[PDB]
Amino acid sequence: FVLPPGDKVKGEKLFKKHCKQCHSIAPDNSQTNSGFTSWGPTLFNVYNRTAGMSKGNSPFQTSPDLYTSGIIWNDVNLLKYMKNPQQFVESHIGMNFKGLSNLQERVDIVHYLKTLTYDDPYGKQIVEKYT
Amino acid sequence: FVLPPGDKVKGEKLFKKHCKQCHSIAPDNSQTNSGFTSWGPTLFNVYNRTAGMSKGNSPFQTSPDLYTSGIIWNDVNLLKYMKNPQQFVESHIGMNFKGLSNLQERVDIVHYLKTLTYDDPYGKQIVEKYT
Ligand code: HEC
Ligand code: HEC
Structure with missing residues (x-):
């Protein structure tokens, strides 16, 4: 596959x-990760950039090897991600967060987070432990 | 509304x-801005923390004011966010990204990003400019 013909001016407008x-x-x-000016990360130099979701299910968490x-x-x-971000996340990392319906579970999570x-x-x- | 009784050990396991x-x-x-150890930001001290999505739709024409x-x-x-993150985002910042169906627009966007x-x-x- 090759990137088909497109119009970068139209692209700026759509962006x-x-x-x-x-x-x-x-x-x-x-x-590049969240940032401080925008909610999401800066999309400057995003092309061929290593994606942030690569850290989801980090193998480094259990070993540096x-x-x-x-x-x-x-x-x-x-x-593909611009087509459907949620399906992309699910298909590339294995799962996403669609929410917890049970209220007591969420309350217990809030108790833990507090x-x-x-x-x-x-x-x-x-x-x-981290100092 | 007050936080109902909850179990922080069950909360840890659920987390x-x-x-x-x-x-x-x-x-x-x-x-707290996703950092690098994890895809999402650290949830340590997230309670009563200002949410990163507050930065979306920023009036940068009057940013200092x-x-x-x-x-x-x-x-x-x-x-609320744990129940349905996408609905929470849509109701608190105004909109959310659900994907672009048309292929040429996505191609043009890639051309602009390149x-x-x-x-x-x-x-x-x-x-x-931005320096
Ligand atoms: C908020 C309503 C958003 C809109 C509209 C768009 N994006 Fe976004 N995106 C947003 C966040 C908060 C994040 C970080 C969390 C995450 O799910 O990754 C992202 C992520 C991306 C990325 C990944 C960048 C990386 O370094 O891994 C890309 C490449 C990206 N978003 C692109 C993108 C495009 C092309 C959009 C319009 C067509 C777009 N985003 C809209 C929040 C929001
Ligand atoms: C990936 C598959 C995730 C899972 C599972 C959970 N979260 Fe997450 N969350 C993720 C990202 C990439 C981001 C940053 C982009 C964004 O949409 O905000 C977040 C964000 C949050 C936040 C906001 C934190 C802030 O500083 O504003 C919170 C409070 C949060 N997530 C909580 C949370 C909980 C309680 C989860 C399990 C019950 C959970 N997340 C799962 C990615 C992923």
Whole structure:
């Protein structure tokens, strides 16, 4: 497959219409993950960039010998992701988050999350483990 | 509304089964923007934290005069977002990306993104401006 003929001016227009609300184009590189100006990461230099979702189900979490170069934002993957982001995530990493319907489970999760703070004993324990 | 009674141990187990795949619990503070250890941001100290999606649809024509991130991850918002993230996004920021059906528009977008690079003439101008 080769990237078919397209119009980059039309592309700028479509980007301002559909993507600019959540994505910057600034060449920060310090914004390539989430960033500080836009919600989503800067899409500058995104072409052939290693995708952030490569870190989902990180093999590094259990061992540094399981390094993974990850998924690349080449032409095909950009086209497919722009077609259907959720199906792309599910098909490339194995699953996505569509929400938890049960209310007690979500409440229990909130109770757990409230302990992940710099003041809670459990949170203080998580802190020293990473210091 | 008050947070109903909950079990933080069951919450930890639910977090490990449903959230740890894409979320760290590391006190990085710099990882709150997805960081690098995980695809999603660290959920450590996420309670009552300003949500990253507050940065979407930013009035950058009056950026110095009108900007005050104000989606807070309090109990209610966490429960709502965990129930249906996409509906939460759509109802709190106004819209969400569900994909572009047409193939030529996506191709044109890829053509525009290929010019966002440190060596393309257009990408060079974007660099010049934002420094
Ligand atoms: C909010 C309403 C968004 C709109 C509209 C678009 N995107 Fe987005 N995208 C958004 C976020 C918060 C994130 C980060 C979390 C995630 O799911 O990855 C993204 C991610 C991307 C990426 C991945 C970048 C990476 O470094 O891995 C790309 C390439 C991307 N988004 C492109 C993109 C395009 C082409 C859009 C319009 C056609 C678009 N996004 C809209 C939030 C939002
Ligand atoms: C990947 C498959 C994920 C799973 C499973 C869960 N989350 Fe996540 N979440 C993910 C990303 C890539 C992002 C950043 C982009 C975005 O849409 O915001 C998030 C974001 C959050 C946030 C916002 C944090 C902030 O700083 O604003 C929260 C509070 C959050 N996610 C919570 C959460 C919970 C409770 C989960 C399991 C029950 C969970 N997420 C799963 C990706 C993924």
